[PDB]
Symmetry: C3
Subunit: 426 residues, 3 copies
């Protein structure tokens, strides 16, 4: 199932065996709550005043390679719907369709078909029972309105993750079933609703004509079940005796990779992706589209089809990288890097250089004064032995500070340092 | 109103037409809640014990160019007030002035005039009605105390945004009216209270002599209605056939710019600023003070009055930048960059290079495997055609990795690469 | 007590006098809540249905030198315990020991001794009193279950800081006393429980056999009361008349330093550390282990025992750094940098260069259009006058863009710029 390979030659590891679940687009839906414009006998007297204060508040409300990523507007789609609800009659168009039912699709003015929902009916409640047991239904239906108000006030009207007050599980699962997507998307979203909530936006919209409206921006997973893999990289330095004469090298192309429509979506920020079992939930807005030949950098970093990105330095500090099925340890200098078991203690001492250890039998990794716990996910690891490529470079002609560089950029910068020695032969 | 210009020569865009609302200073106010030191008939028995537990908890509580920004202490002003409240008698000085009223100004010991507030009076409530209808007022007045306690415990005593429990809308708006500032500030803060909350701090202070105190740090908007504009920049690379031989260039001076007292405040992190309609709420602590000649970089990047900051690389990856009134697309390589309408599909395919499209008629922008929604704010855009300045450079003498550089730094580094060729003429 | 020294020669300051409280390891504990599998008289009718909905939800739930830091898995230890609770019989092993008591240690299958806790007993409550005063105990015991559910749903099952619903103060303090650590750790954690909460994780685990379980990951403070100090650095540029001909220099080794087992733990991100009085709560996962000779860079930056890290540029923009006992001001160009008192106004105007001022007598620092408040902590400051080291460099042979560099890297790069002039003598 989940496997992992470590490349001693490049001091990197690839955790493959995952499945994709990428957000490609958005789905907007207008959630409405009908309100009553109002102006045992004493319990409602103080609970109805919370209603007058929530409406009072809501009216005051409306009235390494990460630097290469694009800069988009996340809620640009949802706000594009709220500018339509501000139009005259566009509110009554929704209030008319949501008359005899709570779920109805309303074709808006600008050719936008939105799935509207009437999740709460306070107008039909305050005007039917609160005109001079039922205090329970009021104190509970009003409590949800207060909670929607609290989230929209301490967030300037944009909520994420979408809480159960903006959309209950019964409303959300019913909204997932009714929205028109494939059967694979419907069950993927239904089995991981808390992930859909974290990738969803609740946008305060308008209060007009006894109605509170707010758009719930939901993710569309156009890419499902395609192979994904996470690349872990660590510095690869030399281990010479005299400190300072050491040169380093680090693959900067680390992050989440997923096959996507002939190309490969690369997420340089592994926190934009979320792993549930072997499923990887990412957001394409934080991605880069790369040719599928980018995977060649793991096996052969010197391949001619893709220029693998690296960074160079002389800072040979020790660091560890907890991988999906093990840990990469870059031990340099006088650092004490060990790998220990829970009930037995230290089982391996890392020699100077970049080494690797699997989580099978290892519980913690110690580098210096820091203790790192390894992930105990079951999986098979593989150690691909090889000569560290940092030994292939001459330290005297090695560029000591390149960050947005690659294998070829370093090689093409070394060769014209060897043009200066064509004058040295005088 | 809101306009935008795109510069093809520099692959950048300027969204002008905004108004300023910058936080220049702070305003401290001590919010107090009087407590009763205590030690239908059974409802209060379990509600009064929440009071004993909240007080028990609170006693345990107290007892690109972003790297150029300054490093300040945000709550340095508010904490400077809490060290004054710990002084002996300084608590009783407040408890004495807040005797017959809830709002009173207390001149503190170190020459600090603070606007004190008694938002809740539990001592006057527990000692007047809870000694052996009113269970409502207790269960609601005590519920606010519990909520103030919950926020101060899960935040180590510092709360932002200031919730309605720390300061209700009635208390906040009354605190805004009573604080001594100009009439323009009072209405700006009163119409955007949820923005003031997000720029405010609630700092737990002290519990001494039956009183709970906490300072609410409020923003002062010394700069209002001055012109602001947001600069969007994208990489500008060459489109040669052989990949790798391409050189790139990107204006690093992007962010929010606002005219401010002869100079211009520059916010390199556009997330420190918040846009409501055409108003821009920024925080000067995340700003840089630049000469007003910085705006010359948009029209002429080679102007002699200001050295426009750029960064160079050979990484010609495709990226898009969703602007205020459109989108900038930097399409390089085999990437499929398109701009589509909602109900009609693709309307433009971007050729290789840096192009631009306005939101009038365009709903989405596709670059690679990513879909970006454009902001649908109404405004007039302008395409300033011009020769891309990256064509003016020779790739063989082009510095391939400069980040904290400028136009002159590149030109002064190219010329001494042309001193090496004065030896080449042998 | 708390002191501070400013180094004019290197434009840096060291705030010493602190004590350490570093998280070295974790402590896992399984928190359990027994549930009843169910399927004045009408109050429970709607409160018991919240119980059926919380269980319904939870079942859907489960079923500068910062780039040198390591990459670990924070909850790798806690999740390693939840994979053990999913084993058959491992749930009943816990449900058996927590029979006659609420606190009991359960030795798990994989040789893991965990301190289990039964914080809530709803099975013993619903099955003892809710089969056809007590509505109070139900509406309050059920309200905690709802709050644990709300946090676990809007956070995908991982909560931090651990709220009082996951673990009350009575349960937490009792869990701190019963866990086996030294007496110094027990009182350190008991006096700063809100800090322990912010460094703790609440991980949703399993619902099986009428039991809800979730692991609370607690910090272990293996390093206590060792000396700590925070290094503040600011750019140090030249003040030549013609702008652009100026060279800059900045010590990149800023952050929190703490003596730790012969070495020194360095935290380049000062936000990973938390200061309470003179105690510094850090997390070693965001640390680097450096030789104790790193402190030599403050007194003599040119010392031969450690290569002090610096960065160079030509960007002479003005910036300020609010220190622990004062403020560092780097005033360059036409910027107006002042230091003012509260009741008297400007008391010092900063000349061009890097200067410093103590908080004794100063309340604010103004640099450009920004107002910075100084921290008013009582302490003695010291101004170590010295020649700024930037004057020791020739601007014509000064590397204008080095970030991951040091004193020796610059000196070894200057000398081979002086090899090019051995050809200039022709
Ligand atoms: C080694 C390293 C590690 C992490 C880090 O954030 C940086 C900072 N940094 C540099 N490096 C500068 C400039 C280029 N080089 C200049 C050689 N003449 C080296 C010093 N280029 C950057 C780019 C392009 C984007 C974002 C950050 C960049 N460098």
């Amino acid at each position: 199932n989940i496997t992992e390979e470590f490349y001693q030659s490049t001091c990197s590891a690839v955790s493959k065996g995952y499945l994709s679940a990428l957000r490609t687009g958005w789905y907007t839906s207008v959630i409405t709550i009908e309100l009553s414009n109002i102006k045992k006998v004493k319990l409602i007297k103080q609970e109805l005043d919370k209603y007058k204060n929530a409406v009072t508040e809501l009216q005051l409300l409306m009235q390494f390679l990460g630097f290469l990523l694009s800069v988009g507007s996340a809620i640009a789609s949802g706000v594009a719907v709220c500018k339509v609800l501000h139009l005259e009659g566009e509110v009554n168009k929704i209030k008319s369709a949501l008359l005899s039912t709570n779920k109805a699709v309303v074709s808006l003015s600008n050719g936008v078909s939105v799935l509207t929902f009437k999740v709460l009916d306070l107008k039909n409640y305050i005007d039917k029972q609160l005109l001079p047991e039922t205090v329970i239904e009021f104190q509970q239906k009003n409590n949800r309105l207060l909670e929607i108000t609290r989230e929209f006030s301490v967030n300037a009207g944009v909520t994420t993750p979408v809480s159960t007050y903006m959309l209950t599980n019964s409303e959300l699962l019913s909204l997932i079933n009714d929205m028109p997507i494939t059967n694979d998307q419907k069950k993927l979203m239904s089995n991981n609703v808390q992930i859909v909530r974290q990738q969803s936006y609740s946008i305060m919209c308008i209060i007009k004509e006894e109605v509170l409206a707010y758009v719930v921006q939901l993710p569309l997973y156009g890419v499902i079940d395609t192979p994904c893999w996470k690349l872990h990289t660590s510095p690869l330095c030399t281990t010479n005796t005299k400190e300072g004469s050491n040169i380093c090298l680090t693959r900067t192309d680390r992050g989440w990779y997923c096959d996507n429509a002939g190309s490969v979506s690369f997420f340089p920020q592994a926190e934009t992706c979320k792993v549930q079992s072997n499923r990887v939930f990412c957001d394409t807005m934080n991605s880069l589209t790369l040719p599928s030949e980018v995977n060649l950098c793991n096996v052969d970093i010197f391949n001619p089809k893709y220029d693998c990105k690296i960074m160079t330095s002389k800072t040979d500090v020790s660091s560890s990288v907890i991988t999906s099925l093990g840990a990469i340890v870059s031990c340099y200098g006088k650092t004490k890097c060990t790998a220990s078991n829970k009930n037995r203690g230290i089982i391996k001492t890392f020699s100077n250089g970049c080494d690797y250890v699997s989580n099978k039998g290892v519980d913690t990794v110690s580098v210096g004064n820091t203790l790192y716990y390894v992930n105990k996910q079951e999986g098979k690891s593989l150690y691909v032995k090889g000569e560290p490529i940092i030994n292939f470079y001459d330290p005297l002609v090695f560029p000591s500070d390149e960050f947005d560089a690659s294998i070829s950029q370093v090689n093409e910068k070394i060769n014209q340092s060897l043009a200066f020695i064509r004058k040295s032969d005088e």
